[PDB]
Amino acid sequence: LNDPVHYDGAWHVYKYSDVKHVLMNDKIFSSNPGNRYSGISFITMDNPEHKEFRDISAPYFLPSKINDYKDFIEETSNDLIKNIDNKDIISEYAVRLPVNIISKILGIPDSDMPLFKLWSDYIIGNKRDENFNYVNNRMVSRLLEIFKSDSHGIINVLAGSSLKNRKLTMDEKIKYIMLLIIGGNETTTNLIGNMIRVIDENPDIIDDALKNRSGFVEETLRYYSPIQFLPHRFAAEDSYINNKKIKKGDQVIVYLGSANRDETFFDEPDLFKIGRREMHLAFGIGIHMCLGAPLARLEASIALNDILNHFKRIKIDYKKSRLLDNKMVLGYDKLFLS
């Protein structure tokens, strides 16, 4: 790991302290592409305005509140992890679980999930075709309708809403939900594929994991950061990082992945020591920290369990399995067993 160097048009950051710092300072390192680049919603939103948007759904992902789904999840997990044998664990499980838990928490039927996950998948760079233009269309439409429908799920909560001295825009409302869809349908799928990996490579940590199904997850998030790095950050004013002068505008590429391996922070980082006493910037840190953090921690845990209690041993047929090849995120595209 070295000092942030400027190349290809942006400084890269691989040290927990500098990363943790680049994020913690959002007034200086605007999480917003002031100019234009083209995730949406309040994730590319800034300091003062940011909070106003994040507020709306904000109370719905609080530990106490998400756990108010504790059963439904394990409910869903069971049916999924029931057969799903010899089958692609990713497609048929890791995908199905969060694509469900979120669809419901939001208002998305069991009929739109195929479309939607299929949608996001394009957004987060995991499949590209000309066929995308009418998925975006073929979906926003489906979304546009759900706002009408009813319930009291996030979407309805977003529907008749607004805040401050303005009424939230419809497109603003759409993008808002698109933010939670790209958060729920994705990234969670990998923290599951990465715990399994941990098992293929470290065969006898099982019995401890069971005992501490949480610290285990919590660890996987440090060892195999689902999201390898955040690319969209830019200098809003001239500042430093170590002994580097960032020019106002300068793109700031903060590599989370590495930061979780920083040696100056984690004793024998490289190992899977469970229970370490330091937080991992996997879910980031700051005003922009993952609002879905509490959500995944559970889904992770429940499944971790559902999994282990369903498979004697755990080998990963690699002649069939392949890790997505998108350097920004770490996870399996296909993972098969035995």
Residues of the shown chain interacting with ligand HEM in the complex, contacts defined by CB under 6 A: 23, 31, 42-43, 54, 98, 102, 179-180, 183-184, 187-188, 191, 226-227, 230, 282-284, 287-288, 290-292, 295-296
3-state secondary structure (DSSP) of residue 201: helix
Quick one: 212 or 326, whose CB is closer to ligand PIM? Answer: 326
Q: How far is the CB of 247 from ligand PIM (least distance, A)?
A: 26
The residue at minimum Cβ distance from ligand HEM is 292
Residue 95 touches which of ligand HEM, ligand PIM, none (Cβ within 5-8 Å per kind): none
Q: Do β-strands 234-235 and 29-30 pair in parallel, antiparallel, or remain unpaired?
A: antiparallel
Quick one: 174 or 296, whose CB is closer to ligand HEM? Answer: 296
Residue 228 touches which of ligand HEM, ligand PIM, none (Cβ within 5-8 Å per kind): none
Helices of type H across the chain: 16-24, 47-57, 63-66, 70-80, 89, 96-106, 113-123, 133-148, 154-159, 170-184, 188-201, 206-211, 213-223, 256-259, 293-308
Q: Answer yes or no: are the C-beta atoms of 246 and 238 closer than 8 Å.
A: yes
Q: Render the burial of 20-37: b for 16+ CB within 10 Å, e for the rest.
A: bbbbeebebbbbbeeeee
Helix (H) or strand (E) segment spanning residue 246: strand 244-246
Rg (CA), the chain: 20
Residue 124 touches which of ligand HEM, ligand PIM, none (Cβ within 5-8 Å per kind): ligand PIM
Work out the number of other CB atoms within 10 angstroms of the CB of residue 304.
24
Q: Answer yes or no: are the C-beta atoms of 3 and 13 closer than 8 Å.
A: no
Q: How far is the CB of 57 from ligand HEM (least distance, A)?
A: 8
Residue 192 touches which of ligand HEM, ligand PIM, none (Cβ within 5-8 Å per kind): none
The residue at minimum Cβ distance from ligand PIM is 39
What token pair was written down for 216? 């285990």
Nearest C-alpha neighbor of 99 from the set 296, 291, 336, 289: 296
Going by C-beta distance under 8 Å and a sequence separation of 6 or more, which residues neighbour residue 5? Answer: 11, 12
Distance CA 180, CA 108 (A): 12
Quick one: 276 or 297, whose CB is closer to ligand HEM? Answer: 297
Q: How far is the CB of 30 from ligand HEM (least distance, A)?
A: 11
Quick one: 187 or 225, whose CB is closer to ligand PIM? Answer: 187
Q: How far is the CB of 134 from ligand HEM (least distance, A)?
A: 25
Q: How far is the CB of 16 from ligand HEM (least distance, A)?
A: 14
**Binding site per annotation, positions for heme b:** 50, 54, 233, 288, 290
Quick one: 43 or 94, whose CB is closer to ligand PIM? Answer: 43
Quick one: 187 or 321, whose CB is closer to ligand HEM? Answer: 187
Q: How far is the CB of 205 from ligand PIM (least distance, A)?
A: 26
Work out the number of other CB atoms within 10 angstroms of the CB of residue 323.
17
**Binding site per annotation, positions:** 50, 54, 233, 288, 290
The binding site for ligand PIM (CB under 6 A) comprises: 39, 43, 124, 182-183, 186-187, 290
Nearest C-alpha neighbor of 337 from the set 223, 207, 193: 193
Quick one: 209 or 290, whose CB is closer to ligand PIM? Answer: 290
Judged on CB neighbours under 10 Å (0-12, 13-18, 19+), 268 is exposed
Q: How far is the CB of 182 from ligand PIM (least distance, A)?
A: 5
Task: Give the max Cα distance, the chain.
Answer: 59
Residue 284 touches which of ligand HEM, ligand PIM, none (Cβ within 5-8 Å per kind): ligand HEM
Residue 217 touches which of ligand PIM, ligand HEM, none (Cβ within 5-8 Å per kind): none
